[PDB]
Write a protein that binds this ligand. Structure first.
Ligand SMILES: [N+]
Ligand SMILES: [N+]
Ligand SMILES: [N+]
Ligand SMILES: [N+]
Length: 322
């Protein structure tokens, strides 16, 4: 009945549970006691490779009436220089195949309550990345996002949040961000979004994120996109970030636990949500220059892999404390 699906018990999933089990087995006493409390904190499930189409059903079977939070992260290319040939065969079509599969599976669970978060990092780059090369990729990314919203955004058992980066990236560009978003919604058919997600995989404070939500909302209203609500990723934002370094930031902490309507002074904010999986690596330390910054925790395994020493740091730095 409520359109804020976070006003429901949230699903805690077996993958996260198993990843924290990994850390727990490596810890003793007090730290281990704190890990056992982090094990059951609900975290989003990412759909992040071709076979994740086959992972949906098990999550929905195990969640029952509890709210499932998925992150759609399947756009087949994020990198420019296509550039051909020419420069895709054929990304949009294959993406539409992934979305249909996932939507078709979701229609089978009418009684589930699903939150779908659409494609982190895409809107940021559409606003700020410069696109001689990328123009072909840019156009395909907008069509990917419209197609995803046009499907999930008509499912009664789903509430869709479109990702829109973070204040640190787009608060000084809120108007162009709103312009981009409105264009995508215009081509999304009858698909409707509940709102916008921010701070995914990033470490900005709730308070500055909410000032971003206020500015983006004002700009979205100006473009005729009214009524939007917001969720913010509190997985790693217990401590203010020392720098703009994205990749396995040192001195991060776990942030506020997932909670619906957490402050009546932030009426636009539907929920704090752990969207990024805390303790999974951002990238291997050798995979990007940013991962060699002096404030990026070295020794990281590949993106998505459990990073035990980073998880420990998050637990130690948790704000509020476990
Ligand atoms: N709400
Ligand atoms: N269900
Ligand atoms: N985000
Ligand atoms: N943090």
């Amino acid at each position: 009945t409520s359109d804020n699906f976070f006003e429901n018990e949230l699903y805690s999933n077996y993958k996260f549970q198993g990843e924290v089990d990994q850390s727990i087995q490596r810890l003793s006493g007090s730290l281990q006691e704190k890990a056992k409390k982090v094990k059951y904190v609900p975290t989003a499930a990412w759909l992040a490779w071709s076979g994740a189409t086959n992972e949906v059903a098990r999550y929905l079977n195990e969640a029952g009436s509890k709210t499932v939070v998925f992150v759609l992260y399947m756009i087949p290319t994020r990198d420019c220089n296509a550039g051909g040939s020419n420069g895709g065969a054929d990304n949009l079509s294959t993406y539409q195949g992934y979305v249909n599969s996932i939507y078709n599976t979701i229609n089978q669970y009418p009684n589930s309550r699903i939150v779908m978060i659409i494609e982190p990092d895409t809107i940021g780059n559409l606003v700020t990345a410069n696109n001689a090369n990328c123009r072909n990729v840019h156009d395909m990314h907008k069509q990917a996002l419209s197609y995803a919203i046009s499907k999930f955004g008509t499912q009664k058992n789903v509430r869709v949040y479109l990702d829109a980066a973070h204040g640190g990236w787009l608060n000084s560009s809120a108007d162009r961000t709103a312009e981009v978003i409105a264009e995508i919604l215009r081509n999304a058919g009858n698909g409707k979004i509940r709102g916008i997600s921010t701070n995914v995989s990033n470490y900005q404070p709730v308070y500055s994120e909410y000032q971003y939500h206020q500015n983006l909302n004002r700009a979205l209203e100006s473009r005729g996109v009214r009524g939007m609500k917001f969720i913010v990723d509190t997985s790693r934002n217990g401590r203010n970030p020392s720098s703009a370094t994205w990749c396995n930031l040192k001195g991060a902490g776990l942030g506020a636990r997932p909670q619906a309507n957490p402050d009546p002074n932030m009426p636009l904010l539907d929920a704090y949500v752990w969207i990024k999986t805390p303790g999974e690596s951002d990238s291997a330390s050798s995979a990007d220059p940013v991962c060699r910054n002096s404030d990026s925790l070295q020794g990281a395994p590949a993106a998505g892999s459990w990073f035990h020493d980073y998880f420990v740091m998050l637990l130690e730095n948790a704000n509020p404390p476990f």
